[PDB]
Write a protein that binds this ligand. Structure first.
Ligand SMILES: CCC1=C(C)/C(=C/C2=NC(=C\c3[nH]c(/C=C4/NC(=O)[C@H](C)[C@H]4CC)c(C)c3CCC(=O)O)/C(CCC(=O)O)=C2C)NC1=O
Ligand SMILES: CCC1=C(C)/C(=C/C2=NC(=C\c3[nH]c(/C=C4\NC(=O)[C@H](C)[C@H]4CC)c(C)c3CCC(=O)O)/C(CCC(=O)O)=C2C)NC1=O
Ligand SMILES: CCC1=C(C)/C(=C/C2=NC(=C\c3[nH]c(/C=C4\NC(=O)[C@H](C)[C@H]4CC)c(C)c3CCC(=O)O)/C(CCC(=O)O)=C2C)NC1=O
Ligand SMILES: CCC1=C(C)/C(=C/C2=NC(=C\c3[nH]c(/C=C4\NC(=O)[C@H](C)[C@H]4CC)c(C)c3CCC(=O)O)/C(CCC(=O)O)=C2C)NC1=O
Ligand SMILES: CCC1=C(C)/C(=C/C2=NC(=C\c3[nH]c(/C=C4\NC(=O)[C@H](C)[C@H]4CC)c(C)c3CCC(=O)O)/C(CCC(=O)O)=C2C)NC1=O
Ligand SMILES: CCC1=C(C)/C(=C/C2=NC(=C\c3[nH]c(/C=C4\NC(=O)[C@H](C)[C@H]4CC)c(C)c3CCC(=O)O)/C(CCC(=O)O)=C2C)NC1=O
Ligand SMILES: CCC1=C(C)/C(=C/C2=NC(=C\c3[nH]c(/C=C4\NC(=O)[C@H](C)[C@H]4CC)c(C)c3CCC(=O)O)/C(CCC(=O)O)=C2C)NC1=O
Ligand SMILES: CCC1=C(C)/C(=C/C2=NC(=C\c3[nH]c(/C=C4\NC(=O)[C@H](C)[C@H]4CC)c(C)c3CCC(=O)O)/C(CCC(=O)O)=C2C)NC1=O
Ligand SMILES: CCC1=C(C)/C(=C/C2=NC(=C\c3[nH]c(/C=C4\NC(=O)[C@H](C)[C@H]4CC)c(C)c3CCC(=O)O)/C(CCC(=O)O)=C2C)NC1=O
Ligand SMILES: CCC1=C(C)/C(=C/C2=NC(=C\c3[nH]c(/C=C4\NC(=O)[C@H](C)[C@H]4CC)c(C)c3CCC(=O)O)/C(CCC(=O)O)=C2C)NC1=O
Lengths: 246, 69, 162, 172, 172, 162, 172, 172, 162
């Protein structure tokens, strides 16, 4: 009669005694309890969302502006010879949302100077995604759509396709400062979206600056390159051999 | 927006009554919960897509006025 | 892992700013209340085994049908895993006491709680009852301030499970 | 991504040739046996939590080192991440099963995955084992003859075995 | 980004064990003298602009080729970049000093700093020398006996010196 | 303007959650140590006028040319405006002391300060020297926690000026 | 967006002079009961889901039509949102109890909710009934002398009563 | 009878594959840090009379009813059998500690011990208590640092504790 | 099975006594010897396929007739069986390397080898010279210490066959 009465003291005793081998330290987890240290993206994930409600005060409004500049312009410095004061004032009374102010910054000449002129168009699309959306591009469907939209409808419509998009509507919306969110699994992505955001993001200290030795070359078209247009590699090989043998 | 069509921004009044609230329930809350009614301004060049978008979300408008002319 | 220290530093850095008076004030309060909290963690670490055993007992007694065969509680393995789970919760309560903040709880037990408890069909109520018990003799074990701290963290865990 | 319909189209195109009569024959056969394919896909879909829970139970039974402290699946956030990964791989296998070709599974899911886990430090041998365990626990649901007309479906069983093997080989 | 307490907690968790009694003694001793740590952080914060200004003055007196035309810090924008780098690094040293561990540095301050400086063509030796000069300018303020209670703080001095040295060595 | 209390309210509402252990602990530190700052503010409001004259005199000795014609300081009306400005700074410092936070100081002085100095061509060094006199004298009126709180707030104002 | 201290500062600045005898007197009086208020805040935040559940059960007890089809809370999602809103108003009441000023709750939500519930079709007197139900439940949970030192907390019970009364009046 | 190496080999054989890289690393690390295991086993062997005598003292002072007439360890024969059982269990715990695996313990001393004790009427609760007392008295010896080079052996302590707990929970 | 640790424990257990010095010294010798064995196992495991193919081709060279139609070797199935057999021997050699004992061989191969070779008419010389090929191939794969261990196990299996 193992335990007729209510008290379970033997079962609990043996359960506790056997739980000891279950909590033994595993193989190792020094760099594994945070794989973000391998990603080197701890700060971006632990940087909470910054918002601007309707009744907001002076405090953190400067903080909201600092977060906006640090996101939109990368870690690249922005001298107050470049900060648009009129846009900030238009934001202060809520005449424009944070989305509208970000549209303004995207259409300033500082944003263009940094990301549009010294760069190609692939790099421009990658940076537009990484800054105004938080994620890397997924495939050349996005690149082709955005490049055609640029050449056909101007930089204005090109940036609007990022700002007034559906994705920007849910994930950030009117009053949320964009954050790097491709590190966490975002629904409906390729496994290369995370890899692309990891490749674009070199660290908390680094930035995607125009004024460096490399001249701000593309980081990801090499990464995004193979899957889209290298399915026809095998037959193109026979075509190239046939051309060579002539 | 360089030409005359670009200017004359309009002021749009938007309400997010239950017809949109049910769609937000089925989709989820990913931006902080906000009041149903407010007042918004949209440029003419972007008036069509923005209003298609707000109808897509399910929000219903009250009326629109002209800030210029 | 949020602390007072880490929360302060992250808020400060999010405004590119040095630590002003108010932030150091919060850190000073944290360092002044780190004595009762470390004392409470020391007490709950002395009595880890009594707490785990009692909590397993209480879970079984309040949910007798679990241990009967054809159920999750049947078998040595699942009750060993029960005691393992309660040891996890107790360990993270002591961690949240030492770190004077719910950082360890939110990082380890509450991060992805419902999805795991759903995909393994585990019931929140079992752990709520275990934590209610641990709260029960935590009141009895700790005098005054350490009692209130430990009860704050245990109530955080319970409301996370609820 | 491409189903087998658009495979037939693409191979017809890149040689500038109309689709042959024989190719139309194979694709019409694909269409007629399509209803069984829908049955298999629905079997994968409606029994997803069962397959995932069974595979997870077996997986953490075989190698306990994941769930104990210092293990990859331990801190109860990474456990949810593990289950979510398995759900994603199951979802993409069902997509490839409905389509007919592994384009979905090999493009939208498996391209950047092995080095994603290399970056995270996640063991990939365990992930491949998890995929094979899902294959085992999903064949039994796929073969369930109850509440459906009876027929031969060894073709689809081989197809799903190949998709699970493909995912497990790519990931590992 | 982990204070002393959370670093100790992480080590305890990896060992799958409760926090030892000696570790709790260490953390209690830390939190006991934490008012001295707060004073040092307030001296690095309150007297920050003086530290940046003095360190920059000594740096640009000792090494003049930076401000020369063609020098790395020549135009106004590059001088402002110098000042903001120095202020950020002092800020992160204050952050580490309050937290108690260099986790904030290696997470945020120094995460890709060498890569940035090798991309910009900046001489990392100059930046390390600037951090050294900030060390010398900051030790004076930290050791200011005026306006505080008299007490030994040699441990804080060694800790902050190690933080500055680590920042310089990571930049170098 | 917010103190520790209202910043806690703000962050808890921002995350859409209640107040956890860390928030209540920081608010606890602020509540319990509100007193010494309150006697600091008492000692400062007892001595506002003496400090106004002391600060204006100190800045005038340090800047002799300001009093001479050809500069702003010349004229009795400008003298009274200097006195009013230093009185404003002292009042806002006592406001911050009572509030236990830089809120009142920050949004009543710092917000839109550099532009205003640029517009009326006011040298921030005048105010910096005046506040340095305020600090140097405050080294004697107050002792203990009250004194260090007053000096922290004066130092914050001085840093914000530079 | 202001508490008691910042409210007094605002009035002192509008009248323009320093803060006088009586203002600092009440501010010190409020400071001594800071922990006395912290404990009430902690009770509210700890019993929040319990208070919400009890208020839901009561409100659905005396008044039934909402449960019945056609009620504003009939569908499963709508009554989920009902619990969400009642939780939010309880949270803002806890905020008001902490700070001491109704304004933070008032300006943020009291104005908007009126017209919003006009738009949605909710009978506001039911919302006021829910407000008083949480009033009663929170008083029950806060009067608990056990597990804390006893005291004359009649001031805080009265203040919470005022918060709930004004919330119920303003929503209605 | 197994050790950790043969356990890994047998599991690999059941799978049918060569030993994985991670398994090889674990076995190599076990071998590398196995000299601490030799020290622990030598400590258990060398002090065994001390552990047994201390456990017997505490048990029989704690549980008086055994050594009473009509008690279950009353005559010299039963007392000698008691001490011999303690010695055998400690011997097999040291065996399992050297082997790194509890197979020899659960295979020679515990496959039929609860049934034997029950059929003899011996109180299994007291036997488990005796095993726990040996555990404590043996930890007091393993943690000793005399005669050996100081190092970290927390994992070995946890493992020996788990072996004692395996015995105590498979007897009771 | 039968390794150094296992033989030590079994010997100390049959005699019914604690583990004295000599047992511990043998254990230490094995523990320190385990490293070379581990990288030897790494080397053979990495070169699995090349070693198997080379062994099969050495078989088909030294015994040319076996590949003729009408004998054991003819037929793709029989070639696959030969490759599988070589893989089995190689795998158990790596197993015995890791265990630092001849246990896995004596259990999974040597135990009952002659009976099963005789039943299916399998010629022991086939595997003898295939193991000779592997023996030569680890002449270059492994050098120094671990080569002695790998050669020792290969030749022990060869001796078991003959
Ligand atoms: C049925 C046959 C039988 C006998 C006779 C017997 C004797 C016996 N001797 C014991 C040890 C002991 N025996 C002694 C006797 C000493 N006291 C001193 O005054 C003397 C110099 C000396 C006796 C001449 C003492 C002090 C212990 C205590 C050792 C201990 O605490 O474990 C114990 C353990 C009891 C305990 O630890 O409290 C027993 C039961 N046991 C049996 O089963
Ligand atoms: C703003 C500066 C800039 C330019 C102009 C640019 C060109 C460019 N050409 C592309 C592909 C392409 N480029 C070409 C054109 C080539 N193929 C034919 O053989 C011709 C001989 C030859 C044209 C002279 C074609 C046909 C594609 C499509 C490839 C494919 O879809 O597989 C792409 C990627 C997808 C797209 O078409 O948008 C870009 C971005 N990239 C830049 O950053
Ligand atoms: C300031 C923070 C805040 C509050 C307080 C808030 C309340 C709020 N509740 C709403 C809907 C609702 N509100 C209720 C609740 C009512 N019906 C009955 O259950 C009760 C008598 C009564 C509550 C006690 C219901 C049922 C709905 C659903 C209407 C619908 O889905 O169409 C809505 C309309 C949009 C939405 O669903 O989010 C708001 C704005 N929203 C906020 O962002
Ligand atoms: C870091 C924090 C952490 C927590 C909190 C945690 C809970 C937890 N307990 C588990 C095991 C389990 N837990 C239970 C339920 C318990 N056992 C029963 O005896 C009781 C009635 C009940 C407790 C009161 C069961 C039945 C299992 C194993 C069966 C299964 O997973 O389906 C599992 C699944 C892992 C496995 O398969 O072994 C998790 C995730 N794990 C963690 O890593
Ligand atoms: C749409 C296609 C797609 C896939 C498949 C995908 C996999 C994926 N799994 C992840 C996390 C993870 N996944 C796992 C699962 C592993 N742990 C154990 O070894 C298990 C055996 C195994 C599960 C099968 C773990 C532990 C993490 C967290 C890793 C960490 O925090 O270090 C992450 C990092 C983002 C996150 O933190 O959630 C990715 C990108 N991502 C995608 O976009
Ligand atoms: C509502 C969405 C939908 C479903 C679910 C669907 C499946 C479906 N399968 C059918 C027959 C069938 N279903 C199956 C498949 C089953 N038999 C095999 O033994 C397995 C147990 C299993 C597949 C692995 C087979 C073999 C047939 C016979 C058709 C044939 O002869 O090819 C039928 C026709 C019989 C009927 O209507 O009752 C349907 C509608 N079609 C749909 O439009
Ligand atoms: C985590 C916080 C953080 C850090 C640490 C950081 C470092 C940093 N410093 C930068 C520029 C710079 N920094 C300096 C200053 C250095 N060169 C001289 O030798 C000085 C002696 C020395 C100062 C100690 C200079 C001159 C540049 C501009 C270099 C260039 O434009 O080529 C840049 C490039 C941004 C831009 O495009 O303007 C970064 C990212 N950025 C950050 O967001
Ligand atoms: C903003 C919130 C806040 C802070 C930060 C604060 C600082 C502070 N400084 C203190 C004294 C002290 N401060 C120091 C530190 C000094 N020793 C010198 O050599 C160094 C220049 C310097 C540190 C490097 C020391 C040693 C004491 C005496 C108390 C002790 O030794 O622990 C005390 C204890 C009360 C006392 O005994 O006077 C506090 C609370 N007060 C506050 O309300
Ligand atoms: C981190 C959150 C926190 C907690 C848990 C906390 C507990 C706490 N309660 C205290 C006393 C007290 N606590 C209370 C509050 C209780 N009195 C009863 O009537 C009510 C049921 C209830 C209020 C709703 C009172 C009235 C005192 C006496 C101090 C006083 O007001 O004079 C004190 C001061 C020292 C003492 O115990 O004498 C603390 C620190 N303090 C905190 O900062
Ligand atoms: C004949 C039987 C035999 C014994 C007894 C033996 C002991 C032994 N202990 C050693 C080191 C060691 N011994 C220990 C174990 C001790 N240190 C820990 O703090 C504990 C107090 C205790 C174990 C619980 C440790 C930790 C090392 C150093 C291991 C290292 O990190 O390299 C070594 C390596 C050389 C040395 O440093 O002296 C030997 C040979 N070897 C043998 O062949």
């Amino acid at each position: 009669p193992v335990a007729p009465p209510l008290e379970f003291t033997r079962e609990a005793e043996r359960a506790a005694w056997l739980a000891g081998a279950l909590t033994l330290p595993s193989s190792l987890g020094h760099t594994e309890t945070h794989g973000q240290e391998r990603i080197r993206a701890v700060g971006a994930l632990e940087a909470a969302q910054v918002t601007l409600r309707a009744p907001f005060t002076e405090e953190q409004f400067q903080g909201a502006l600092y977060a906006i500049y640090k996101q939109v312009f990368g870690n690249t410095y922005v001298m107050e010879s470049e900060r648009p004061t009129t846009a900030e004032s238009q934001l202060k009374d809520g005449r424009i949302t944070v989305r509208g102010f970000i549209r303004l910054l995207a259409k300033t000449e500082a944003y263009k100077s940094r990301f549009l002129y010294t760069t190609s168009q692939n790099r421009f699309i990658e940076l537009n995604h990484k800054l105004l959306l938080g994620r890397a591009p997924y495939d050349q469907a996005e690149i082709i759509r955005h490049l055609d939209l640029w050449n056909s409808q101007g930089y204005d419509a090109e940036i609007d396709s990022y700002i007034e998009s559906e994705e920007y509507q849910e994930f950030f919306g009117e009053e949320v400062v964009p954050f790097f969110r491709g590190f966490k699994y975002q629904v409906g992505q390729n496994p290369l979206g995370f890899n692309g955001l990891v490749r674009l993001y070199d660290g908390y200290a680094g930035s995607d600056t125009e004024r460096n030795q490399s001249g701000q070359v593309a980081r990801l078209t090499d990464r995004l390159s193979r899957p889209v247009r290298e399915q026809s590699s095998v037959d193109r090989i026979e075509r190239l051999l046939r051309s060579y043998t002539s | 927006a360089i030409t005359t069509q670009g200017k004359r921004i309009y002021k749009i009044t938007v309400s997010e009554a239950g017809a949109y609230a049910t769609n937000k329930h089925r989709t989820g809350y990913r931006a902080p919960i906000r009041q149903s009614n407010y007042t918004l301004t949209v440029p003419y060049d972007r008036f069509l897509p923005e209003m298609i978008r707000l109808h897509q979300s399910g929000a219903k408008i009250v009326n629109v006025t002209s800030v210029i002319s | 892992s949020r602390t007072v220290i880490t929360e302060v530093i992250a808020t400060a850095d999010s405004q590119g700013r040095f630590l002003n008076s108010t932030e150091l004030q919060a850190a000073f309060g944290r360092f002044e209340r780190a004595v009762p909290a470390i004392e409470a963690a020391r007490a709950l670490t002395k009595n880890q085994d009594a707490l785990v055993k009692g909590a397993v007992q209480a879970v079984f007694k309040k949910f007798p049908y679990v241990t009967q065969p054809g159920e999750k509680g049947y078998g040595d393995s699942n009750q060993a895993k029960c005691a393992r789970d309660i040891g996890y919760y107790l360990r993270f309560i002591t961690y949240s006491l030492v770190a004077s903040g719910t950082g360890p709880l939110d990082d380890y037990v509450i991060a992805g709680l419902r999805e795991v408890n759903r995909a393994f069909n585990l019931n929140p109520l079992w752990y709520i009852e275990a934590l209610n018990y641990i709260k029960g003799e935590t009141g009895k074990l700790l005098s005054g301030q350490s009692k209130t701290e430990a009860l704050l963290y245990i109530d955080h865990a319970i409301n996370a499970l609820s | 991504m491409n189903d087998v319909f658009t495979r037939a189209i693409a191979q017809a195109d890149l040689k500038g040739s109309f689709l042959l009569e024989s190719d139309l024959d194979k694709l019409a056969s694909f269409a007629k046996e399509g209803v069984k394919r829908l049955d298999a896909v629905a079997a994968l879909t409606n029994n997803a939590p069962a397959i995932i829970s069974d595979a997870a139970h077996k997986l953490f039974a075989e190698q306990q080192e994941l769930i104990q402290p210092g293990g990859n699946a331990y801190p109860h956030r990474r456990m949810a991440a593990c289950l979510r990964d398995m759900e994603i791989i199951l979802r993409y296998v069902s997509y490839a099963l409905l389509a007919g070709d592994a384009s979905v599974l090999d493009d939208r899911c498996l391209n950047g995955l092995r080095e994603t886990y290399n970056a995270l430090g996640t063991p990939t041998q365990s992930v491949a084992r998890a995929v094979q365990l899902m294959k085992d626990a999903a064949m039994v649901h796929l073969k369930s003859t109850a509440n459906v007309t009876v027929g031969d479906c060894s073709s689809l069983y081989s197809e799903a075995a190949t998709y699970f093997d493909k995912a497990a080989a790519s990931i590992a």
